[PDB]
Design a protein around this ligand. Structure first.
Ligand SMILES: C[n+]1cn([C@@H]2O[C@H](COP(=O)(O)OP(=O)(O)OP(=O)(O)OC[C@H]3O[C@@H](n4cnc5c(N)ncnc54)[C@H](O)[C@@H]3O)[C@@H](O)[C@H]2O)c2nc(N)[nH]c(=O)c21
Ligand SMILES: Nc1ncnc2c1ncn2[C@@H]1O[C@H](CSCC[C@H](N)C(=O)O)[C@@H](O)[C@H]1O
Length: 262
């Protein structure tokens, strides 16, 4: 009554027992194996081509199906350690990549490794993108949204980055990948259609994502209907909460390799 499918989903999620939530997080999702790569982020090995974060595999999932084909100048807002930046540098059509994150006592500190094409990567900490001016780009990236147990707080936060991203979409990317932390409220499906009407694109759910978050990524390579695509992911997560759990589909993490300009 009066609630969206996503709203009716997150309510039951907040009422799950500790074990009911633990066994449900990874049930039936796809996940990249990062064990041997975490022994690389600490051994100082920058040559092995490992990923710094799991975001490298997530973006590798999206770029490898035309959901976004980066090129020219690319920009990743909230790069953290640059999981999205180090994969974008391996793309052959891109030239300049710049990452930006604060990395203060509030969040993750950027890491610099030697993945293939690391010379074109510019990751600096100490930036607040909510007070940053938009620069011309051909590929916009944004992975900022922060979880919250209240569907209204996730809404109040997601509209803030979508209003900030409108200044970078005012710089007209050629291919973008914007994360919509909460797309499932009646105010959300409203705005996401309003932005797609003027700037194009569509939303898509990545199998790298957990069952605990309703996050979806607004891409430039998919033209899906908004309300139907969001509701599809809503109904998809609900079925996983009732029956017996299912094993996670493991995969090999990206291997960005090593090298220089080419
Ligand atoms: C940790 N946790 C998260 N969620 C739910 O999953 C959604 C996203 O969960 P997340 O795991 O993706 O979030 P994050 O990326 O920060 O990792 P982590 O698992 O460590 O969760 C930490 C955050 O979850 C929130 N949280 C902690 N405990 C609970 C709880 N009992 N119920 C709801 N939210 C919680 C807190 O705001 C905390 O900051 C949250 O909105 C929440 O409804 C939980 N639900 C139950 N029923 N029991 C839990 O323990 C729980
Ligand atoms: N308001 C803000 N301004 C700048 N960076 C922010 C921000 N809010 C969150 N962030 C940053 O966004 C990052 C998201 S983690 C994403 C990292 C990377 N895109 C990857 O996929 O691997 C966090 O590390 C956090 O530091």
């Amino acid at each position: 009554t009066g609630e969206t499918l996503g709203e009716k989903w997150k309510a039951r999620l907040n009422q799950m027992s500790a074990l009911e939530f633990y066994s449900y997080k990874k049930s039936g999702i796809t996940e990249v194996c990062r064990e041997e790569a975490r022994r690389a982020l600490k051994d100082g090995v920058a040559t092995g081509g490992h990923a710094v974060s799991r975001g490298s595999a997530k973006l590798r999932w999206l770029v490898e199906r035309g959901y976004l084909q980066p090129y020219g100048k690319v920009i990743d807002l909230g790069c953290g350690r640059g999981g999205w930046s180090y994969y974008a540098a391996t793309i052959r059509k891109v030239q300049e990549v710049k990452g930006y994150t604060k990395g203060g006592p509030g969040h993750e500190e950027p890491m610099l490794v030697q993945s293939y094409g690391w010379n074109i990567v510019r990751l600096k900490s100490g930036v607040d993108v909510f007070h940053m001016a938009a620069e011309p780009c051909d590929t916009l990236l944004c992975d900022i949204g922060e979880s919250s147990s209240s569907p209204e707080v996730e809404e109040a936060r997601t509209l803030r980055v979508l209003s900030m991203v409108g200044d970078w979409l005012e710089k007209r990317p050629g291919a973008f990948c914007i994360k919509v932390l909460c797309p499932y409220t009646s105010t959300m499906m409203e705005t996401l259609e309003r932005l797609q009407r003027r700037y194009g694109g569509g939303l898509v759910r990545v199998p790298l994502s957990r069952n605990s978050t309703h996050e979806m990524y607004w891409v430039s390579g998919a033209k899906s209907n908004t309300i139907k695509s969001v509701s599809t992911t809503s109904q998809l997560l609900l079925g996983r909460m009732d029956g017996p759990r299912r094993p996670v589909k493991y995969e090999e993490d990206v291997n960005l390799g090593s090298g220089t300009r080419a």
